[PDB]
């Protein structure tokens, strides 16, 4: 069901500056998971993004909807397991159908709601949207594949 | 106004990153209270430090967030909302007492500063109140800050 | 115009400041037509802090970013030419993006080249496609919408 | 004297938000002296102020706290990095903090902690932060050591 | 042992991590006698922030550091060859750096090509010299004493 | 006696690349003591290195060289912000550079610079890294004061 940092820490890879979920609230085996990052100016990106106008970038927006859509496909395949999380990886292989409607600013709980729309051996394809305060602010759909870490 | 936003925080606080800790601002009566908040998120440099492989973010920078929320409160209720005053001043700490930390703070809390004016007379402003997380009660604080022009 | 810009042209054109601007380059330039870009990678990015410890790969949705910045850079100087006056007045906003994949990983060392077509413009919109390559080889692949809109 | 290295390896405090440099005096149960050294190359002066560094003074009590922590840590276990390595440090309480000279680049900032109470893992300290013999900050502080 | 290397190489060899690892690939080494290295130079650098504000030039220092680290990895490789295990336990400590030379400045955008030779070596102690390059051009030229120490 | 926000108005350098934090001792022609302080909270530390703090020997080196360029510039134009703006110092040559003892975390990095020789723009300046009274580096450093562009 709920999962924190401690918990998201031990199973994806992704560390500082590019861990870009901070907790899991809803999370349904082979159909769904919700999950959220808070968006502060307290963070790096904005010193460049842009000067005297923080946005968040759409592009990690989409990043943290494929951390959401991995950690979904990882905890279906084998529920929380750090161990064999250690010898996985999700290799992202496309990304499509994305629409940015509302920028994301400091103060904004950025919330990613992602689906299954298709598994199909080592292969998920999932989908969905970006949310802030119940409105769609982006869309994508995302292709990954599960493989053996190296 | 009673809500402002980063944009209106960046054009009135002298602090910048990694040192501004107040991201929006709900509510402000002039010359009384202020309520004001930061996200805290995992994407943030303190957490490198504090503590590696377990994040919780530092009782010292929740109290400089509800200072800064503070000096918000004392700068717009000295001059309103005015930029071109605001760009050459500085804010400094004289006193902190009284601060409780209850409940530690992590990666995805919405971080709500309550700030009541205690006392203040011209640029020396005495703050008290709380941090909360959903409605929790995770500090208390009360703070004295001195609004000055930067020479 | 010139075809070839350094990174002293870069800055007064992008409003793309550190750690969000990754074109280092500008190559090849045809007024609302097309663009060859790229970016150096190197170990000394902080981004390789956290994508991966022990195994750095740049990230993907950045090689796109990086695509998007070259796209935002041909759109602005054919319809401006280069002004940093009016460069100051703009910022570029993603409005969608299409048909990405990633085909080959990005690593220290490599040369992060973008080349980038307008597919279609009127006005502030702008939609380019193309490719990332490195050595020659289509490292990947992306369509992207751009809109250049006023700084308010 | 306790270098950054052992240091190390009794506060958990990892960048940026190590704070203490060097133990130079060491009483168990009485008292601690300790520096930081402030240096323009800090991450921290980006933003407190831009065109005029101050080391801020939330900043000034946690190295203070940090060192009192060190104190507790010894106090307690003496030099142990093993059982160390299993703990953190809680704030409980801070009272009673003046700040007096601004703290700025250049400065060695000394931390003076001598032990007001303690029980258990509840440790109350207090005393000042120096630079070059006079008083900048004077702060009282509870903390907690955790598993 | 090989003539080329990459990241995934460099860091089992060397200790230096971020924002102190400054070689990217290996592209040439010969045991005893030579390295062919190189940092690839973006404006993605933190470095670049402060070195200078609008005009960003990478360190000459760094040049330097670069190329000692180069001749490090070619004085460790040359002894022990491509071995993990050892090299956590040596550190490659410059003694002595001469006759230090700036001759063209480098900027994002550049791949920082150190060229190193070994003048002497006898047992720890080595001392090389060589050039920092950017596309053929010498921008950069130094000697330097370098000791493999003891880690612990 | 230069303090960091005079050290900010003639040096062009910005974090995390100005290596200087107080001017002590400044005689025009002739020499310079200043220092930086070293502490564990410098980003440089993650990488130079991991478990083992050791400030870069070529960073005690850039430290002695902005030193130098200082001591050049108010030589020759005092402390004339305005002036600085138009001026670049441009290092040409590095020589006779020694490191014998680490600088560390809680160290006070002092350098002691002394003009060797100058012929109008050029200037030759050498001198030491001091740690505590002893030597921990020396260093001969030739700059070219220069118009910006
Ligand atoms: O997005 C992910 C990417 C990776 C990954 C890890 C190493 C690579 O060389 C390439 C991709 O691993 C993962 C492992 C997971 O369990 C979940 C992920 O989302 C990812
Ligand atoms: O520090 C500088 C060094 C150089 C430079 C100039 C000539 C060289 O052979 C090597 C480096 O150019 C510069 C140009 C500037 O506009 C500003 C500088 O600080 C520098
Ligand atoms: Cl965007
Ligand atoms: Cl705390
Ligand atoms: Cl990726
Ligand atoms: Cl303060
Ligand atoms: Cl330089
Ligand atoms: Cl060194």
């Given at each position: 069901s709920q999962f924190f940092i401690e918990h998201i820490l031990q199973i994806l890879p992704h560390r500082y500056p590019m861990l870009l979920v901070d907790r899991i609230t809803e999370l349904q085996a082979?159909?769904?998971i919700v999950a959220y990052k808070n968006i502060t100016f307290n963070e790096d990106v904005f010193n460049g993004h842009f000067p005297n106008k923080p946005?968040?970038?759409g592009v990690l927006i989409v990043e943290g909807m494929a951390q959401s859509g991995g950690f979904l496909a990882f905890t279906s395949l084998w529920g929380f397991?750090?161990?064999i999380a250690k010898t996985k990886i999700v290799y992202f292989m496309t990304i499509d159908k994305v629409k940015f409607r509302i920028p994301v600013?400091?103060?904004d709980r950025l919330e990613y709601h992602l689906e299954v729309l298709k598994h199909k051996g080592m292969i998920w394809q999932?989908?969905?949207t970006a949310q802030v305060d119940?409105?769609?602010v982006a869309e994508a759909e995302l292709k990954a594949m599960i493989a053996e870490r190296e």
């Open positions: 082979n159909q769904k946005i968040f970038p397991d750090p161990e600013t400091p103060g999932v989908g969905g119940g409105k769609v």
